[PDB]
Amino acid sequence: MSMSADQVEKLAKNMRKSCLQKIAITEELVDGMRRGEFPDDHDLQCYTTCIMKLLRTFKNGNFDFDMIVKQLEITMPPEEVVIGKEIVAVCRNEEYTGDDCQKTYQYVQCHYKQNPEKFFFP
Ligand SMILES: CCCCNS(=O)(=O)c1ccccc1
Ligand SMILES: CCCCNS(=O)(=O)c1ccccc1
After folding, report:
1. Does ligand 1 come within 6 angstroms of the Cβ of 8?
2. Which CATH number fits domain 1-122: 3.30.1370.110, 3.40.50.620, 1.10.238.20, 3.40.30.10?
3. Which residue is closest in CA terms to ligand 2's atom 1?
4. Domain boundaries, the chain
5. Torsion region of 29: left, alpha or beta (phi above 0 gives left; psi -120 to 50 gives alpha)
6. Ligand 2 centroid – CA 4 distance (Å)
7. Could you say which of 7, 52, 73, 78 has the lowest number of CB atoms within 10 Å?
């Protein structure tokens, strides 16, 4: 089964808390991504890697697309799952370059670009 909205929010907030402290950036900077604010800020980039590593969606220098699909299946509203799979289907085929922080940040931006209105990142 899938997790309820409030359980998704709780886990996201706790992952954020952990990574914000570790990476030493502000909540404002993380919240900016949902507003389409993607500065070339290496610390924000590394925050994205911290979160994806927690979710097991990035590991050993590469995306784990099987786990990205599993995570979206367990956390998205059911009426959004197919649309989410279609976003992953597009973004998985873009080349990601640079260090791990740069790669995950680029992937997150690809997700945003496919649907800015509904974008969410912990
Ligand atoms: C908003 C609904 C989609 C959430 N998906 S998530 O991968 O960001 C995620 C968030 C929180 C816990 C686990 C995964
Ligand atoms: C798409 C939701 C499942 C994957 N979760 S994620 O945190 O890696 C993530 C990557 C990119 C955008 C949002 C969340």
Report:
1. yes
2. 1.10.238.20
3. 72
4. 1-122
5. alpha
6. 17
7. 78
